[PDB]
Design a protein around this ligand. Structure first.
Ligand SMILES: CCCCCCCCCCCCCCCCCC(=O)OC[C@H](COP(=O)([O-])OCC(O)COP(=O)([O-])OC[C@@H](COC(=O)CCCCCCCCCCCCCCCCC)OC(=O)CCCCCCCCCCCCCCCCC)OC(=O)CCCCCCCCCCCCCCCCC
Ligand SMILES: CCCCCCCCCCCCCCCCCC(=O)OC[C@H](COP(=O)([O-])OCC[N+](C)(C)C)OC(=O)CCCCCCCCCCCCCCCCC
Ligand SMILES: CCCCCCCCCCCCCCCCCC(=O)OC[C@H](COP(=O)([O-])OCC[N+](C)(C)C)OC(=O)CCCCCCCCCCCCCCCCC
Ligand SMILES: CCCCCCCCCCCCCCCCCC(=O)OC[C@H](COP(=O)([O-])OCC[N+](C)(C)C)OC(=O)CCCCCCCCCCCCCCCCC
Ligand SMILES: CCCCCCCCCCCCCCCCCC(=O)OC[C@H](COP(=O)([O-])OCC[N+](C)(C)C)OC(=O)CCCCCCCCCCCCCCCCC
Ligand SMILES: CCCCCCCCCCCCCCCCCC(=O)OC[C@H](COP(=O)([O-])OCC[N+](C)(C)C)OC(=O)CCCCCCCCCCCCCCCCC
Ligand SMILES: CCCCCCCCCCCCCCCCCC(=O)OC[C@H](COP(=O)(O)OCCN)OC(=O)CCCCCCCCCCCCCCCCC
Ligand code: SF4
Ligand code: SF4
Ligand code: SF4
Lengths: 176, 318, 155, 56, 388, 96, 70
């Protein structure tokens, strides 16, 4: 099924022709436009008072990355390199080795946040919920170099944001 | 004391322009479901000051291919004309009381077309000149309807004296007697100040900013002040011409309040047109003027010459 | 001493310059639409005095919103040069920051900071309109702490 | 929704329609930002027998 | 003395729809020829895809038509699923159709409002960008990203809808037609908008077909063709809607077609809301779609398949396909070659904007300079998909 | 909170005037919101930390820090790996 | 909402009111407390020139009534 958008012929009688002449000479549809703008002037604006008010987000929101720990304080990352393998932008650089206690742990874990596309594939690939994208989205920097994250930087991000990261994960893990 | 009169006319007009920028931004914002300036000062009341201060401390790039003599003469002419357009205006009593006040305004506003013909030519760039030529053609073409509409309306006044407009409109507004000429006059005034769907010389989405591309910071600011002063002045002329306020010789403040309120209403309507319509094409507005406005204006000038004669309603010439 | 007057004048000029940050619409790619969303009613960048500006001659900040390609870089540098001073550059999005998804491409310059000096790097692909607004306010706070007249007084 | 009766009437008239029934600003009609936990179903091949992968 | 002004510039221009160099010579006032210079946003997407796994290449499609993200990823998912000989589940298909129509609303809002803003009607842009912000919220609630969801994938969708999302989509859609009414109250009957769009950029139906036009650029000229009806995909055959058809093939008819397409998108969205079925949202075949994280942490096969799907990816049987969808900007397609491995051998992306902008010179013939701005706006052009 | 405002304005924070040794009477930013209140403020949940406090961990920062970019506390990247190749050190005893 | 536009409008209104009131009051101050005499035509100018001569103080607006002579 289809429909025509502009297949109406105007009526050609006295009253219709006079209606169109009055519309031509008295600018009635221009007055309708003025009325629409005037009606919008008396509507409450949709503006929010940033930064005192914030745009609404969801637990699934993909922001700044973080490396997480177990309740014991032990790191979750066991350096499987799945996130580095799946990373569409090749933003993840990993080096690992046996730790002094024998654990399988990273010695390098870099994310080039200027290479990153913030797709969240890394946190999908991760089998232990080690790498996540956190809720933070206000981390603009004055230099390019502060956006090339380190393992220390990402672990400090995890320690900084774990309280709300864990709540978001608890909110959404049953969908995953 | 007369010098103080000149100063107390000029300076408040420039302040009114400065805050007209804020008022226009806020009206546009609230018609667009946003707010507009509400952070820099209470309700954006310090925003015009921030704009004026930032502009005068910004580097005024002058073009390497610019005849600097006219490059600086054009803003001087523009602002001097924009300011001097207020000296005959009858807020109850004019600063300058002439027999030919509206003729003086017609002449002074017709001299203002040089500020575009000189800015476009001086800026070179070989393309802003074409925009300047389009602006000049639009301006001169709408000067025709301005002049003829003013001629037809003043046949009830009896003279070119603006103070006589108050007397002419004592019992009734001139709008109730010449509303078709009022609509054509208002749109002609819209077109002359390069506003609304007639802003072809500074089409934000047509030629970025046209004749004002090369101007920056200070001279740009003065050009802007000239345009907004012309806007408020034209709306004041419209209010005095068509919506004459009652005058009490012992209480002229009442007339001033009336006139200021009506001028503000017409200016807010000018900003109202800006937020409601698309932009005319250059040939489309030229067609409007030459084939729609001009024939009706000629017919109505004929009608308004015939009307006082055939009704024994010819005004006094004194 | 006379350093108090210079400090007050610097404060005034830097308040006037950050209260009227007029940016230039350099919308190259997907980051352009989040920036006009920061323009939209919900965030209303005009309420901060940040207007919708025009030709670089009246612009104070360049927002590089999108991928810069090799074919496009000379034009970006040209319009950056044509900006009157003081002028600032905000790099918005991964592509403008360091190449992003297209970092390893033959036709993409890896970060606009190879072409222009950048003041603020807004991360994200795209950064949300709120993230860009945060970057803009951070740029405003950068301008607040400039000491141009105090530098001149101790020269 | 805080607009006075007179302002509502003015804007309804100016727009030509009753815009108070279709406000563009969201209010308590939206869903709660905290929701009960889901329980998602399993696919057709979550079977213990008669499920050889060579047949699917 | 032939000095036809060869103004061969305009990339920084705000009406350039992003990045566009126009080489233009005018016989005085009117355009003689248009020479679009593109490539200013060519990022080598099609070459980069050859170095990416099939899952790794999906986010590239969000950034081609960055006004219609989910439609692009739906087209790519359909191509990969056709090559894989697998079928997405019914609930995933209904979700894909619902978000494709939400995406069509987003794209049509952007197209119409930016067209009007370029013409000089700035006001409708903000009113409708508020609705765009709300639909961005829907995108983010389903995927965590406002624009680049990466949500529709070969095999279905990434995860299910959160509880209460359908209610909010219903709340939004039940009020959206009032906003289309307000947009039409400013443009449709305005004697200035029609003066800028009626009989501007007229294209003949046969000449539209031979120039490779698609979508509204076809149906503006009266051609009764829509991929959602003639060649339905997902569950589009189960949904009822109307195809708006033009009569004059000008900018005004195309604008009316886009507005009525927004209305029919609302009409489809209603049925998607009412007919959403239960079930899984990705194919229950763990050699294509990754298992649930709970099974990945408990079952040996699930862990193995998670590992392999997220490191090597799934192998696609060798072969080539051309699959196209009815994107909001026209026919968006991909010619996807598979050599049998886990990475695409070749991925040519068909974007309607490429053929549409190839026809700018033809449609601008005998028109003023201000009409070319309208003709570009009526061909709605995103250079992310023009240049790829 | 004021639930009679429209969504996006029904919740707001009036920032402190002093945080981490920095005056913030006029200079505030969204990074000053701690993660516990960050979730409620952006409507990721309906529960403030007062009613649903976050789970206590001994490694979670007890003092939230805002964006320290442009300060001497800014992050600067470095290689976290040790040297790969060990050079041969010559003997300190001469052969002659 | 919309009534916050009113502060800028009030500032504009005051700035526009100042010129007319100032003109009226300066005219009253410099013309003997009366309206500034209008001379559009030479007869009115001659009236004012006669007024100046008979005032004795070289000011047209100092009006001599029947108390001057009769
Ligand atoms: C021409 C102007 C004539 C007077 C207008 C008076 C006015 O708008 O009163 C508000 C009042 C309510 O307006 P509303 O949009 O329904 O208010 C929505 C909420 O109720 C609003 O609820 P709310 O809780 O927001 O109300 C509190 C609000 C209440 O604000 C007012 O009552 C403003 C009154 C302004 C006078 O006050 C504030 O928020 C404080 C800030 C005030 C900002 C500046 C106000 C104007 C200053 C003017 C320059 C002064 C020098 O207006 C009316 O009742 C209609 C007046 C219509 C007049 C004709 C059309 C124009
Ligand atoms: C910067 C560029 C500015 C351009 C415009 C400059 C002002 C021109 C208008 C002057 C006033 C006028 O015409 O008033 C008419 C009006 C017409 O009405 P009116 O003459 O009937 O006014 C009342 C007069 N009585 C009482 C006799 C009836 O006249 C006046 O306002 C005063 C008349 C006498 C003026 C004496 C000085 C004249 C100076 C003219 C300008 C000379 C320089 C021009 C520029 C040269 C540049 C190199
Ligand atoms: C006994 C009485 C004897 C005398 C009778 C006198 C005549 C009475 C009937 C005539 C009525 C029409 C008068 C002229 C109207 C304009 C003429 C014209 O060409 O119009 C159509 C023209 C052209 O319309 P068009 O493009 O549809 O038609 C062109 C020609 N054809 C039909 C062949 C295509 O349109 C315009 O002028 C549009 C103007 C654009 C700007 C709109 C602004 C809107 C806001 C206005 C607010 C109010 C303004 C005044 C404010 C107060 C001022 C103090
Ligand atoms: C001309 C006079 C110039 C006087 C000196 C410069 C101005 C004051 C200092 C700079 C501005 C303040 C600043 O930098 O930040 C804000 C300052 C704080 O800046 P701060 O840098 O000291 O704060 C540092 C610490 N933090 C940021 C953490 C809080 O706050 C104020 O309240 C300053 C108020 C100053 C006075 C304001 C007057 C307003 C205008 C009144 C008259 C109306 C306008 C008339 C205009 C003319 C019309 C014709
Ligand atoms: C409407 C507007 C009406 C007029 C408003 C006037 C407002 C006056 C207040 C101050 C205005 C800005 C003054 C400083 C100029 C901008 C600036 O920061 O310059 C830094 C510069 C820095 O100089 P510098 O030598 O350190 O650096 C220049 C060389 N490079 C860039 C290579 C490093 O200051 C100066 O050049 C000297 C300024 C002297 C003091 C001026 C005081 C104000 C004078 C006018 C009153
Ligand atoms: C006109 C031509 C040029 C005139 C030049 C001479 C005047 C120069 C001074 C101009 C105003 C300077 C203001 C000082 C800075 C300032 O106030 O910053 C805001 C500062 C805050 O600066 P801030 O840097 O923190 O910026 C705001 C940041 N947030 C939103 C997070 C708070 O606040 C104050 O100073 C509070 C008092 C405001 C001033 C009083 C305004 C009264 C109303 C005046 C209306 C206009 C006149 C009628
Ligand atoms: C009963 C009472 C009378 C009712 C009215 C009767 C006459 C109606 C008006 C005349 C209509 C003539 C036919 C017509 O429509 O001509 C249109 C034609 C071209 O118009 P255009 O817009 O260029 O369109 C081009 C093609 N697209 O036009 C042309 O080619 C030329 C038109 C020239 C018009 C000149 C007008 C001059 C000013 C006239 C008004 C002032 C008074 C003059 C004296 C009038 C005396 C009666
Ligand atoms: S979000 Fe995507 S691009 Fe960024 S590090 Fe993770 S996988 Fe790589
Ligand atoms: S962060 Fe996760 S996916 Fe990446 S290496 Fe560590 S355990 Fe593997
Ligand atoms: S950073 Fe991401 S959203 Fe921005 S232009 Fe690049 S690909 Fe598009």
């Amino acid at each position: 099924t289809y429909k025509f958008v502009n297949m109406r012929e105007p009526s050609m009688d006295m009253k219709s022709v006079t209606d169109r002449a009055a519309q031509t000479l008295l600018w009635t549809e221009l007055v309708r436009g003025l009325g629409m703008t005037l009606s919008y002037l008396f509507r409450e604006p949709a503006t929010i008072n940033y930064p005192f008010e914030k745009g609404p987000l969801s637990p699934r929101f993909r922001g700044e990355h973080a490396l997480r720990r177990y309740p014991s304080g032990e790191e979750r990352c066991i350096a499987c390199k799945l996130c580095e393998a799946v990373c569409p932008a090749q933003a993840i650089t990993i080096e690992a080795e046996p730790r002094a206690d024998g654990s399988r742990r990273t010695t390098r874990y870099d994310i080039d946040m200027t290479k990153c596309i913030y797709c969240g594939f890394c946190q999908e690939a991760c089998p232990v919920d080690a790498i996540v994208e956190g809720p933070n989205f206000e981390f603009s920097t004055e230099t390019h170099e502060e956006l090339l994250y380190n393992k220390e930087k990402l672990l400090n991000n995890g320690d900084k944001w774990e309280a709300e990261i864990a709540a978001n994960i608890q909110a959404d893990y049953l969908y995953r | 004391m007369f010098m103080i009169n000149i100063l107390s006319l000029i300076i408040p007009i420039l302040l009114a322009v400065a805050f007209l920028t804020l008022v226009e931004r806020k009206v546009l914002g609230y018609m667009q479901l946003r707010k507009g300036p509400n952070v820099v000062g209470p309700y954006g009341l310090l925003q015009p000051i921030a704009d004026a201060l930032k502009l005068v401390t910004k580097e005024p790039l002058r073009p390497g291919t610019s005849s600097i003599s006219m490059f600086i003469i054009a803003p001087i002419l523009g602002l001097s004309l924009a300011l001097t357009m207020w000296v005959p205006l009858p807020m109850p009593y004019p600063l300058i009381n002439m027999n030919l006040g509206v003729l003086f305004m017609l002449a002074m506003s017709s001299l203002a077309v040089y500020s575009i013909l000189w800015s476009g030519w001086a800026s070179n760039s070989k393309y802003a000149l074409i925009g300047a030529l389009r602006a000049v053609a639009q301006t001169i073409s709408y000067e025709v309807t301005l002049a003829i509409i003013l001629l037809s309306v003043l046949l009830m006044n009896g003279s070119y004296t603006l103070s006589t407009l108050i007397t002419t409109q004592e019992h009734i507004w001139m709008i109730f007697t010449s509303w078709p000429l009022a609509m054509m006059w208002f749109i002609s005034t819209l077109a002359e100040t390069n506003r609304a769907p007639f802003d072809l010389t500074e089409g934000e989405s047509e030629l970025v900013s046209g004749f004002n591309v090369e101007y920056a910071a200070g001279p740009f600011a003065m050009f802007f002040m000239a345009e907004y002063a012309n806007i408020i002045m034209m709306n004041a002329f419209t209010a005095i011409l068509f919506l004459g306020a009652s005058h009490d010789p012992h209480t002229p403040e009442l007339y001033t309040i009336n006139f200021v309120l009506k001028t503000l209403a017409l200016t807010i309507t000018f900003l109202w047109i800006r937020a409601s319509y698309p932009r005319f094409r250059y040939d489309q507005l030229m067609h409007l003027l030459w084939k729609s406005f001009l024939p009706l204006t000629l017919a109505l000038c004929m009608w308004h010459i015939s009307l006082p004669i055939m009704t024994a309603s010819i005004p006094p010439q004194s | 001493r006379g350093e108090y007057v210079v400090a007050k004048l610097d404060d005034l000029v830097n308040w006037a310059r950050r209260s009227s940050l007029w940016p230039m619409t350099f919308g190259l790619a997907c980051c352009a639409v989040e920036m006009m969303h920061m323009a939209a009613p919900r965030y209303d960048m005009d309420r901060f005095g940040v207007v919708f500006r025009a030709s670089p001659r009246q612009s104070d900040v360049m927002i590089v919103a999108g991928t810069l390609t090799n074919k496009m870089a000379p034009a970006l540098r040209k319009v950056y040069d044509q900006m009157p001073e003081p002028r600032y550059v905000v790099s918005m999005g991964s592509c403008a920051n360091g190449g992003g998804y297209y970092h390893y491409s033959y036709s993409v310059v890896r970060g606009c900071d190879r072409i222009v000096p950048v003041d603020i790097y807004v991360p994200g692909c795209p950064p949300t309109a709120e993230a860009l607004l945060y970057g803009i306010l951070q740029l405003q706070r950068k301008i607040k702490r400039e000491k141009r007249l105090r530098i001149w007084y101790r020269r | 929704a805080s607009a006075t009766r007179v302002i509502q009437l003015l804007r309804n008239w100016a727009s030509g329609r009753d815009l108070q029934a279709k406000l563009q600003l969201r209010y308590q009609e939206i869903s709660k930002r905290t929701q009960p936990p889901p329980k998602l179903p399993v696919g057709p091949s979550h079977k213990l027998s008669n499920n050889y992968y060579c047949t699917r | 003395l032939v000095s036809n002004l060869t103004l061969n510039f305009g990339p920084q221009h705000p009406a350039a729809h992003g990045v566009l160099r126009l080489v233009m010579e005018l016989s005085g006032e009117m355009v003689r020829k248009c020479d679009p210079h593109i490539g200013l946003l060519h990022r080598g997407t099609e070459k980069l895809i050859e170095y990416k796994t099939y899952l790794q290449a999906l986010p590239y499609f969000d950034r081609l038509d960055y006004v219609s993200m989910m439609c692009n990823e739906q087209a790519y998912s359909l191509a990969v699923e056709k090559l894989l000989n697998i079928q997405p589940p019914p609930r995933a298909q209904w979700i894909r159709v619902l978000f494709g129509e939400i995406t069509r609303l987003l794209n049509h809002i952007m197209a119409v409002t930016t067209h009007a803003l370029d013409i000089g009607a700035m006001t409708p842009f903000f009113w409708m960008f508020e609705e765009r912000e709300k639909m961005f919220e829907f995108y983010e609630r389903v995927s965590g990203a406002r624009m680049h969801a990466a949500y529709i994938r070969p095999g279905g969708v990434h995860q299910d809808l959160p509880l209460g999302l359908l209610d909010d989509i219903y709340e939004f859609s039940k009020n959206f037609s009032f906003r289309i009414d307000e947009l039409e109250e400013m443009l449709t009957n305005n004697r200035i908008w029609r003066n800028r769009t009626v009989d501007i950029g007229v294209v003949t139906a046969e000449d539209a077909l031979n120039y490779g036009f698609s979508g509204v650029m076809l149906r503006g000229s009266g051609i009764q063709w829509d991929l959602r009806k003639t060649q339905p995909y997902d569950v589009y055959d189960q949904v009822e809607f109307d195809v708006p058809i033009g009569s004059r093939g000008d900018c005004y008819d195309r604008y009316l077609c886009r507005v009525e397409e927004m209305r029919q998108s609302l009409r489809i969205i209603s049925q998607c809301l009412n007919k959403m079925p239960p079930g899984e949202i990705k194919v229950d075949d763990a050699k294509v779609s990754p298992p649930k994280r709970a099974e990945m942490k408990t079952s040996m096969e699930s862990l193995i398949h998670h590992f392999k799907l997220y490191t090597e990816g799934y192998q696609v049987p060798p072969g080539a396909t051309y699959t196209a969808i009815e994107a909001p900007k026209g026919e968006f397609g991909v010619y996807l070659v598979s050599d049998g491995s886990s990475r695409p051998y070749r991925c040519k992306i068909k974007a309607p904007g490429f053929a549409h902008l190839a026809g700018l010179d033809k449609m601008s013939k005998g028109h003023m300079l201000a009409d070319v701005v309208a003709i570009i706006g009526t061909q709605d052009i995103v250079f992310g998909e023009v240049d790829r | 909170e004021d639930n009679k405002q429209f969504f996006g304005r029904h919740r707001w924070v009036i920032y402190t005037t002093e945080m981490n040794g920095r005056d913030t009477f006029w200079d505030v930013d969204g990074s000053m919101v701690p993660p516990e209140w960050h979730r409620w403020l952006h409507c990721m949940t309906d529960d403030p930390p007062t009613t649903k406090p976050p789970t206590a961990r001994k490694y979670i920062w007890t003092n939230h820090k805002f964006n320290v970019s442009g300060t001497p506390q800014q992050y600067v990247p470095y290689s976290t790996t040790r040297k790969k190749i060990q050079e041969w050190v010559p003997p300190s005893t001469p052969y002659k | 909402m919309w009534f916050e536009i009113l502060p800028g409008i009030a500032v504009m209104a005051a700035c526009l009111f100042i010129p007319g009131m100032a003109t009226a009051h300066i005219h009253k101050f410099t013309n003997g407390g009366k309206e500034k005499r209008v001379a559009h035509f030479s007869y009115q100018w001659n009236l004012m020139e006669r007024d100046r001569c008979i005032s004795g103080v070289n000011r047209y607006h100092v009006t001599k009534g029947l108390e001057n002579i009769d």
